[model samples]
Target: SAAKQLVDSTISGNKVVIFSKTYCPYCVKGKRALEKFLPKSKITAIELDGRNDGAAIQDYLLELTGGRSVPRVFIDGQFIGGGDDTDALARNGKLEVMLRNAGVLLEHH
Candidate 1:
């Protein structure tokens, strides 16, 4: 319950929040790529391995979707999937609309 509350608060407050482990290379790629499309300060990366409730939160994430792995990413409370997923979304131009809808970007004027 509390874990969900914390996760909700974290994502709601920040446009981009990533559940990651510091030692994960995929997490590194996810963070680096995500920041490229979002504000450096707006990207909230929670190092799960450094926290006490990391495993619990990870389980809750799996409960959310079958896709459960480190570098779990959410944008504007929208689950954007893992590193590869994000990159694919970006490549296909889906991320542009997603970010704009999240108020993270503006349409080309």
Candidate 2:
């Protein structure tokens, strides 16, 4: 329950949150994808390995997203999948729309 609540709060409190690790290459890709549209400050990347409860949180992620992969990307509190998924969304030109819908990006004139 504690682990789940932590995940929820982190997700809900941020417009974009990436559950990532510092050494993860996929995590880097996921973060880069989001940064293409939003500034680095606009995204919150929680480095699981850097936290004491990282393992527990990751365990909850597997339950929540069907995988325990690093770079679990969430937008507007919605799970969108991992690194490749985020990159794919960006490549398809849909990531920008999703960011705008989530209010992370203001519609440009």
Candidate 3:
């Protein structure tokens, strides 16, 4: 299906990608959380609300994620759930490990 294809291709070679909306607060937090953990440009974010195919993309995302909500997060080409989920991972001190596992981070020492 188109939704599946979109979701697959969007996260294909990216470490972290967020499907989001400009007006969504969760999207903001998700992006911020990744920023806090990852280096610059490690996060690939697309705001559906800002694109010409925004609505179509959102609809596809709905079927793709089983929910039509912004801030659908993909980490290392894997769906890790939404903003709250990402925040939870960060809060619990697991995000750094995940980033390292994903090859998106290196030893800061």
Candidate 4:
């Protein structure tokens, strides 16, 4: 399903994950913010819309996160809440630190 593929890709490809909805402006902003700190290739953005796979994924996300919302962010398999949480982290100047700690950020390009 969508969520399974998302989780699998996150675990297999990149260390940071952004489960988002297509039309969510907050998701776009959060993605832009993360892109500022890391390579676009290092971030996985999963859109959960208009697919049965997404529905399955949403169910799993709700079970795991205890919330029903889009833009569910995760770093290194750790749930980091939604876009607001990510923006907060970025505003506090801790998002980079967190990504670095997760081995998703590097000084050398």
The candidate that achieves the highest lDDT relative to the unseen native structure: 2
Error (Å) of candidate 3 at residue 95 is 1.9
Q: Per-prediction TM-score, please?
A: 0.87, 0.94, 0.86, 0.82
Give me the overall lDDT of model 1: 0.82
Candidate 1 lands at a TM-score of: 0.87
lDDT tens digits, residue span 18-108, model 4: 8888899888878887888887777888887855477788788888788768888888888888888898888787887888888877665
Off by over 4 Å in 1: none
Clashes of each: 0, 0, 0, 1
Per-residue error at 2 for model 4, in Å? 8.1
lDDT of 2 by residue, 1-109 (tens): 8889999999999989999999999999999999889999989999999988999999999999999989899999889999999999988988888898998787777
- Under the 3 Å rule for N, CA and C atoms, how many clashes does model 4 have? 1
Better of 1 and 2 by TM-score: 2
RMSD of 1: 1.7
lDDT of each: 0.82, 0.92, 0.82, 0.80
Q: How well is each residue in 1-109 modelled by candidate 3, as lDDT tens digits?
A: 5555766888886778999888888988888888887754878888888877777777887766778788889888777778898888888878878888988878687
User: Candidate 1: which pairs clash?
Assistant: none
Report each candidate's C-alpha RMSD, comma-separated, in the order given.
1.7, 1.0, 1.9, 2.7
Candidate 4 wrongly placed segments (more than 4 Å): 1-13, 107-109
- Scored against the true structure, residue 60 in model 3 reaches a CA lDDT of 80
